[PDB]
Amino acid sequence: IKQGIREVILCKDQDGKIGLRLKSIDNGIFVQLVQANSPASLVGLRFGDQVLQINGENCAGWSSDKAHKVLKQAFGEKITMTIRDRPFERTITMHKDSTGHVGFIFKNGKITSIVKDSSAARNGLLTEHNICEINGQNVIGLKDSQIADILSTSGTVVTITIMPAFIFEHIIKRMAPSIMKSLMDHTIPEV
Ligand SMILES: Cn1ccc(NC(=O)Cn2cccn2)n1
C-alpha cells in the first residue's frame, strides 16, 4: 500500500475497453474488477483502489452507473485518473516455519483463525478479513485449494494483503463469482 495519490494515463483498446468495473462505496468510487490483458491492468490499477478523479473531474458522490457512463463517454486517446492506493487494505509480511506454515486457517477466502505461536500470531493477522493479494498477486475469486497452492509454492516469505470482510463483501456485491474467478487479473505484474 503506497504513498497517497498517483496519476495514470489509460487508453481504450481496439474494442473500446479499459478492463475495469467500478463500485460506489461511502461516497467514493473503488475498483471492483480489473481484467487481465487490459489497459487498466497494464497501467497497474488494483482491486480496492480508489478513483479520485477521472479526466480531471472529481468522483465524489457518483453512482457506479455514472462512473461506468463516464468511462463510456470519453475519447479513448487519453483517459487520466487520480488513484489512491488500496485505502481499505493493509499488507502483512510473514515467515514460514520448518513445516511450511504461516499459521492460520481460512475459508471462502476469509481468515477464520490464527494459530498460537505462529508468524501470523506474532505479526498480528486478524480474522474476519478476506485475502485479496499474495506476494503482489490477486487471488480474489480463486478457490481455497488454489490460494493454498500459491502459499505452498511461495518462498519462505509470504506477503498477504487483507481487507475487512464487511468492506470486502460490500465491494464485490453484484459481481458474479465466476467473473471474478475468470476475468479478475490473477497474474504477477509485468516489467
Ligand atoms: C460475489 N462474490 C464474488 C466473489 C466472492 N467471494 C470471494 O471471492 C471469496 N474470496 C476472497 C478471496 C478469495 N476468494 N463473492
From Swiss-Prot:
Instruction: Please give the tissue specificity annotation from the record for this chain.
Output: Expressed in lung cancers, including adenocarcinoma, squamous cell carcinoma and small-cell carcinoma (at protein level). Widely expressed. Expressed in fetal kidney, liver, lung and brain. In adult highest expression in heart and placenta.
Domain (PDZ) spans 7-86, 91-166
Q: Alphabetically, which GO biological process terms does the record hold?
A: actin cytoskeleton organization; chemical synaptic transmission; intracellular signal transduction; negative regulation of receptor internalization; negative regulation of transcription by RNA polymerase II; positive regulation of cell growth; positive regulation of cell migration; positive regulation of cell population proliferation
Indicate the impact reported for residue 143 to A.
Answer: Disruption of the cooperative binding of C-terminal peptides from FZD7 and phosphatidylinositol-4,5-bisphosphate
Tell me where it resides. Answer: Cell junction, Focal adhesion; Cell junction, Adherens junction; Cell membrane; Endoplasmic reticulum membrane
Binding residues annotated for a 1,2-diacyl-sn-glycero-3-phospho-(1D-myo-inositol-4,5-bisphosphate), in chain numbering: 108, 143-144
Post-translation changes: Phosphorylated on tyrosine residues.
User: One GO molecular function term?
Assistant: frizzled binding
Q: Name one GO cellular component term.
A: membrane raft
Induction note: By IFNG/IFN-gamma in melanoma cells.
Alphabetic keyword roster: Acetylation, Cell junction, Cell membrane, Cytoplasm, Cytoskeleton, Endoplasmic reticulum, Lipid-binding, Membrane, Nucleus, Phosphoprotein, Repeat, Secreted
- Source superkingdom: Eukaryota
User: What membrane topology is given?
Assistant: Peripheral membrane protein
What is the protein's known function? Multifunctional adapter protein involved in diverse array of functions including trafficking of transmembrane proteins, neuro and immunomodulation, exosome biogenesis, and tumorigenesis. Positively regulates TGFB1-mediated SMAD2/3 activation and TGFB1-induced epithelial-to-mesenchymal transition (EMT) and cell migration in various cell types. May increase TGFB1 signaling by enhancing cell-surface expression of TGFR1 by preventing the interaction between TGFR1 and CAV1 and subsequent CAV1-dependent internalization and degradation of TGFR1.
Assembly and binders? Monomer and homodimer. Interacts with SDC1, SDC2, SDC3, SDC4, NRXN2, EPHA7, EPHB1, NF2 isoform 1, TGFA and IL5RA. Interacts with NFASC and PTPRJ. Interacts with SDCBP2. Interacts with PDCD6IP. Forms a complex with PDCD6IP and SDC2. Interacts (via C-terminus) with TGFBR1. Binds to FZD7; this interaction is increased by inositol trisphosphate (IP3). Interacts with SMO.
Which protein is depicted? Answer: Syntenin-1
According to its UniProt entry, this protein's organism is Homo sapiens
Q: State the taxonomy lineage.
A: Eukaryota, Metazoa, Chordata, Craniata, Vertebrata
Span within the full-length protein is 108 to 298 of 298
